[PDB]
Amino acid sequence: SLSYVKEGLAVLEDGRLIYITPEEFRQLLQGDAILAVYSKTCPHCHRDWPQLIQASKEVDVPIVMFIWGSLIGERELSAARLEMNKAGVEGTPTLVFYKEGRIVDKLVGATPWSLKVEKAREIY
């Protein structure tokens, strides 16, 4: 359950979380990557979670995660907060698409993983 996921910054790789630093988070966002803006207290993120996990097993581009929860670190938070601003994020979940480090699309709300995979193919 998303409720038992440790909050922080991570990369979701073939369905597995690898926790990262704010530095690596920023680094990954200069290239091709999908940023997932998530929250553990969000019922929509709970619905979407299984779908997002599956998507990570169908695409090659890194899915970078921000997962909000109470014990998130100050710097982890600011790093994510910056990108959430620049992308114009207004709720969760939201996927933000980075190409060569530029924000070029968003997918808002819970969706089946098929729809996430289509958007990735369209863009990468």
Side-chain angles (χ1 to χ4, degrees), residues 1-98 101 103-124:
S1 154
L2 180 65
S3 282
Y4 313 145
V5 173
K6 174 69 209 203
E7 57 267 51
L9 308 184
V11 48
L12 186 55
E13 176 151 90
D14 292 341
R16 299 183 316 272
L17 293 161
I18 301 158
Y19 283 81
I20 67 193
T21 60
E23 295 68 45
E24 192 56 20
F25 182 84
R26 268 185 305 256
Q27 203 67 252
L28 290 160
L29 295 181
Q30 329 257 49
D32 288 9
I34 307 165
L35 163 69
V37 179
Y38 258 47
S39 173
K40 289 173 58 145
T41 71
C42 171
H44 311 286
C45 301
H46 281 253
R47 311 231 327 291
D48 190 62
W49 182 223
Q51 296 306 306
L52 180 62
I53 299 303
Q54 269 301 144
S56 81
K57 304 148 104 140
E58 318 283 336
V59 300
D60 288 328
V61 68
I63 300 192
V64 179
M65 296 208 63
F66 164 73
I67 304 175
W68 192 88
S70 282
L71 293 105
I72 187 110
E74 277 203 44
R75 334 212 222 210
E76 299 182 320
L77 176 52
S78 62
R81 199 176 47 214
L82 174 61
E83 297 306 320
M84 296 164 63
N85 295 332
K86 320 205 316 211
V89 166
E90 295 184 331
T92 54
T94 292
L95 298 186
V96 179
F97 293 80
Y98 292 74
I103 297 170
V104 298
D105 211 359
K106 292 194 279 180
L107 176 53
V108 178
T111 79
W113 65 259
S114 68
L115 227 161
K116 329 194 179 298
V117 171
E118 282 171 17
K119 178 75 50 201
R121 293 164 172 187
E122 193 177 331
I123 283 142
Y124 309 101

